[PDB]
C-alpha cells in the first residue's frame, strides 16, 4: 500500500540512461568455491588506458581497449570469449586487493601469506611497460604483521597526493602510508578504534573513516580528528549498525552504507545519502535512506558496496558483493536531494549466471574513460564513444557495459590514453644479485 510517506524512497524511472553490454571476457578460470571475503580485484589507469586484474593465476595487466569487444546487433549476449592475451605477473600469494595511485604510477597488491601474514606489494607501473624486464617485480613491500586481522578490507590512494594511501584492516586498525622510492608509515590508529572503511575527501585534504559504532569520522592525513558524523537517528540501540563503506562525494555530501553491527549477512546493508549542514545553516544532518538499491540475493559473501562518483553526471554508481546488479543514485535538479534510477529492463547492467547455474557477483568494479570506439546499433544510428563500466565477477569473467547518458547537457568524459615515459621507474631497494 506504499503507505507512511515518510518511509518512501526517492525513485525515478529513467529512460535517458542505458547500460549496454559488451561481450563478456573470461580472464581467470572459474574458481572451485565461491569467493567470500571482501575483495577489490580490478583497478584501472585512465591516464594510460590500462586495466589490472587480480586472480588465481596472479596479476593480469591489459591495454584496456583489448578487453572491450562490442556486441554486434543480434549477437548472443550470453556468450563468453576467452582472454585477449595480456601481461601475466605471477604472485607467490593470492591477491585480495588492487589499487592505483592518483598519478597512476604505483599499483598496490595486497596478499595473504600463512607464513608472513598480510603483505602489500607496490609495483611501479612503468615496469610493466618496460619490455627490458622479463620479470615484473615490486619495488617495495609493506608487511602488515597480522593474519586474519591483517586482511585489507579497504585501501584507497589519495586523489591528489601521489604517495599517500590509506589502509584499513579486518582487525579495525588503519594506517596512512607514504610510498615514494620506499614505504613509510605516516600515521596509524590501533584496532581498538574499530575502523571498517575509509574514503578521502574530493581533493585529498581529509580522510573519512567509517566505524564499527556506526559513525563516520573526518581526520586530517595525520589522523587528527576533525569532525564526527553521527550514526543516523533511525538506527536504534537495539539494532546497532556499523559503517560498511563510505564515499565522500562533496564537502558536505556522503554516501554511507550501513550493515548489521554483528557482521550478519542475512540483513541487507542500507545505502544512505547524508547531507551535512554548513556551520552556517542551523539545519540538522539530513540522512535519506535508499536501502537496498542493489538487490542482495547472495547471503554467503562478506558485504561490500563498490561506490563511484561521476562528477560530470552528478551521480553515484553502486555495485554490491551480494548483488548481480549495478544501480545508480543521482542528484536531482535542486542539487540537494538524490534519487534512485530505475532503468528499463533492456537497459540494465546485471552479471551473468555461470554455466553451472549459479549467479556471478562482483569482485572488482572500475570505469574506463579512455574508450574511443563508437557504438554501432544500426546502419542508421551510431552513438559517440561512451565510458565503460567494468565488473570482474566471482566466476573470473569481465563484464563490461557502455554507459550511455542522454540526459540534457551532460558533456563528454572520454579521453585518449596518454603515453607513458619509462623515465623515473623505481628499482627494488634490496635486490642484491640472484
Amino acid at each position: 500500500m506504499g503507505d507512511e510517506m515518510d518511509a518512501m524512497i526517492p525513485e525515478r524511472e529513467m529512460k535517458d540512461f542505458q547500460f549496454r553490454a559488451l561481450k563478456k571476457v573470461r580472464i581467470f578460470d572459474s574458481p572451485e568455491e565461491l569467493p567470500k571475503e571482501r575483495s577489490s580485484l580490478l583497478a584501472v589507469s585512465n591516464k594510460y588506458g590500462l586495466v589490472f586484474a587480480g586472480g588465481a593465476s596472479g596479476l593480469q595487466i591489459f591495454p584496456t581497449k583489448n578487453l572491450l569487444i562490442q556486441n554486434k546487433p543480434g549477437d548472443d549476449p550470453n556468450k563468453i570469449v576467452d582472454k585477449v592475451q595480456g601481461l601475466l605477473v605471477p604472485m607467490k600469494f593470492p591477491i585480495h586487493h588492487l589499487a592505483l595511485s592518483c598519478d597512476n604510477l604505483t599499483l598496490s597488491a595486497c596478499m595473504m601469506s600463512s607464513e608472513y601474514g598480510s603483505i602489500i606489494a607496490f609495483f611501479d607501473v612503468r615496469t610493466f611497460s618496460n619490455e627490458a624486464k622479463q620479470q615484473k617485480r615490486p619495488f617495495a613491500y609493506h608487511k602488515l604483521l597480522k593474519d586474519a586481522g591483517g586482511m585489507v578490507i579497504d585501501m584507497k590512494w589519495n586523489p591528489t597526493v601521489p604517495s599517500m594511501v590509506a589502509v584499513c584492516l579486518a582487525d579495525g586498525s588503519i594506517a596512512v602510508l607514504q610510498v615514494t622510492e620506499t614505504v613509510k608509515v605516516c600515521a596509524t590508529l590501533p584496532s581498538t578504534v574499530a575502523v571498517t572503511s575509509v574514503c578521502w575527501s574530493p581533493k585529498g585534504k581529509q580522510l573519512a573513516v567509517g566505524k564499527q559504532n556506526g559513525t563516520v569520522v573526518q581526520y586530517l592525513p595525520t589522523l587528527q580528528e576533525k569532525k564526527v558524523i553521527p550514526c543516523p537517528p533511525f538506527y536504534e540501540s537495539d539494532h546497532p549498525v556499523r559503517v560498511l563503506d563510505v564515499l565522500w562525494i562533496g564537502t558536505y555530501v556522503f554516501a554511507i552504507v550501513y550493515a548489521a553491527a554483528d557482521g550478519t549477512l542475512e540483513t541487507s546493508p542500507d545505502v544512505v545519502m547524508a547531507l551535512l549542514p554548513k556551520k552556517e545553516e542551523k539545519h540538522p544532518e539530513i540522512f535519506v535512506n535508499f536501502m537496498e538499491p542493489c538487490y542482495g540475493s547472495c547471503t554467503e559473501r562478506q558485504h561490500h558496496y563498490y561506490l563511484s562518483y561521476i562528477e560530470e553526471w552528478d551521480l553515484v554508481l553502486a555495485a554490491s558483493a551480494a548483488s548481480t546488479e549495478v544501480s545508480i543514485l543521482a542528484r536531482q535538479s535542486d542539487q540537494i536531494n538524490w534519487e534512485s534510477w530505475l532503468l528499463e529492463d533492456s537497459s540494465r547492467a546485471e552479471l551473468p549466471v555461470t554455466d553451472k547455474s549459479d549467479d556471478s557477483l562482483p569482485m572488482g568494479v572500475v570505469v574506463d574513460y579512455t574508450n574511443q570506439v563508437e557504438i554501432t546499433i544500426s546502419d542508421e544510428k551510431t552513438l559517440p564513444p561512451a565510458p565503460v563500466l567494468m565488473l570482474l565477477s566471482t566466476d573470473g569473467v569481465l563484464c563490461p557495459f557502455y554507459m550511455i547518458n542522454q540526459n540534457p547537457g551532460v558533456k563528454s568524459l572520454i579521453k585518449t590514453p596518454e603515453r607513458l615515459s619509462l623515465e623515473g621507474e623505481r628499482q627494488p631497494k634490496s635486490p642484491g644479485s640472484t
Side-chain angles (χ1 to χ4, degrees), residues 264-284:
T264 289
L265 301 183
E266 300 74 57
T267 300
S268 67
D270 290 331
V271 180
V272 177
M273 289 308 294
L275 170 54
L276 309 179
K278 313 189 180 185
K279 169 155 318 290
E280 47 165 60
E281 285 177 298
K282 285 198 166 183
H283 311 128

Side-chain angles (χ1 to χ4, degrees), residues 341-362:
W341 283 355
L342 303 179
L343 304 177
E344 300 192 58
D345 291 306
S346 61
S347 297
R348 298 173 180 176
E350 288 183 44
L351 290 176
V353 179
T354 66
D355 66 27
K356 257 186 169 183
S357 316
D358 299 34
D359 286 331
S360 62
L361 305 161

Side-chain angles (χ1 to χ4, degrees), residues 361-381:
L361 305 161
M363 293 191 83
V365 176
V366 300
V367 174
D368 169 46
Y369 292 96
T370 64
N371 172 230
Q372 299 294 311
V373 185
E374 55 174 40
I375 304 174
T376 289
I377 66 291
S378 178
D379 197 3
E380 167 54 59
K381 184 146 295 181

Side-chain angles (χ1 to χ4, degrees), residues 192-265:
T192 58
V193 187
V195 176
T196 64
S197 47
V198 296
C199 188
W200 296 96
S201 67
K203 304 315 178 187
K205 306 174 70 178
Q206 281 181 45
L207 180 73
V209 309
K211 304 187 60 169
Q212 178 57 39
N213 59 43
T215 68
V216 173
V217 181
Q218 288 180 213
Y219 285 98
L220 291 171
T222 57
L223 291 186
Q224 165 169 295
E225 185 173 307
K226 291 299 300 184
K227 182 192 295 186
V228 179
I229 304 174
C231 184
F234 47 82
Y235 288 133
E236 47 167 285
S237 58
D238 237 295
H239 277 61
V241 290
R242 63 184 190 69
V243 178
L244 180 71
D245 281 286
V246 57
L247 181 66
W248 200 337
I249 299 169
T251 306
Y252 306 103
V253 179
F254 291 81
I256 312 177
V257 186
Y258 303 88
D262 61 32
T264 289
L265 301 183

